[PDB]
């Protein structure tokens, strides 16, 4: 069903990611230079606050500035509704692409197929530019989003594009702010692949757990310290299924980066994303030998202190003929 009041569609798990990307890009979508994806809780309850508004308005502005794609849940619940509202607001004041994936099974007031109009057991936002529903079946609304969104992100990550330096590749950064366990599972699977994640060290209950982490008894104590009601409700047997995951979160500190709550800088969003992305290139070792791509990447991302301290530093024979092209740029 296609609805306009943006494009809509029904998604099947078996559908190949390459075919979906080809559809998107060829038909309605331009080449992607960045894929900022926000992962949070789909629960209606959210910790709305002025700080939460400020920590996301800058993100939206950066996404527009670089032309990045924004992937979200997109079911008109808390953070997702705010994201849709901010996308609309930016459109009012040269377009933003916001794909929102949800589960078909949960969908209520189903209107099967041709431009049917729906007016109104899952509610869906109508502000997203593109909205996708995926459920091969099981109308009981089981978790199905993870089976397709992660595969799409990984495929786009491997898709090489000769632009924005970064070894002719695409960033594919994950941004975590919600307190849901689904967010924890998404973080685990993303860490499984070569995708750096940045977590907010603020109101997020589970995000605060991960922030404090950076000794299973300490893990249990930290988990108890946050969301005590959920900790008590969960059975003891299932607790293991979480503890191991936390270890995987703390398995590698190279990728995981977090923001400082105390910092009140206006450009903290850009700086954090830039640093987290930069670490992945530095540690990848694919282009670590290459000493010119690093500077070209660091230039586009406004970072003077990092460029001065790391790129040039000392004991490097760049010579006067090394800066020609980068200085021109």
């Amino acid at each position: 069903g296609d609805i306009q009041f943006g494009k809509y569609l029904r998604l099947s798990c078996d559908t190949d990611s390459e075919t979906l990307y080809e559809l998107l890009t060829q038909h309605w979508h331009l080449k992607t230079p960045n894929l900022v994806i926000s992962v949070t809780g789909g629960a209606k309850n959210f910790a709305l606050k002025p700080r939460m508004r400020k920590i996301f308005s800058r993100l939206i502005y950066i996404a527009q500035s670089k032309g990045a794609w924004i992937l979200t849940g997109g079911t008109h619940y808390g953070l997702m509704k705010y994201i849709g509202e901010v996308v609309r607001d930016n459109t009012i004041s040269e377009n933003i692409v916001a794909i929102g994936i949800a589960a078909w099974g949960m969908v209520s007031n189903r209107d099967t197929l041709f431009s049917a109009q729906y007016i109104m057991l899952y509610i869906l936002d109508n502000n997203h530019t593109h909205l996708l529903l995926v459920d091969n079946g099981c109308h009981g609304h089981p978790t199905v989003e993870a089976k397709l969104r992660n595969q799409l992100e990984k495929y786009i990550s491997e898709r090489t594009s000769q632009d924005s330096n970064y070894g002719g590749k695409i960033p594919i950064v994950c941004f975590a702010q919600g307190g849901g366990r689904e967010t924890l599972k998404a973080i685990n699977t993303s860490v499984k692949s070569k995708i750096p994640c940045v977590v907010v060290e603020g109101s997020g209950q589970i995000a605060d757990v991960i922030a404090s982490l950076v000794t299973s008894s300490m893990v249990k104590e930290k988990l108890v310290r946050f969301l005590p009601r959920t900790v008590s409700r969960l059975p003891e047997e299932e607790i293991e299924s979480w503890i191991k995951w936390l270890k995987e979160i703390l398995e590698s500190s190279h990728l995981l980066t977090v923001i400082k709550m105390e910092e009140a800088g206006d450009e903290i969003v850009s700086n954090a994303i830039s640093y987290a992305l930069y670490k992945a290139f530095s540690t990848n070792e694919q282009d670590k030998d290459n000493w010119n791509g690093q500077l070209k990447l660091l230039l586009e991302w406004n970072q003077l202190d990092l460029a001065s301290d790391e790129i040039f530093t000392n004991d490097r024979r760049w010579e006067s003929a090394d800066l020609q092209e980068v200085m021109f740029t």
């Binding site: 569609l9 029904r10 078996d14 559908t15 075919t19 979906l20 559809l23």
Partner: peptide
């Protein structure tokens, strides 16, 4: 073309 692509995607 769009109809054919939609049909192929649906399978």
């Amino acid at each position: 073309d769009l109809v054919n692509f939609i049909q192929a995607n649906f399978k």
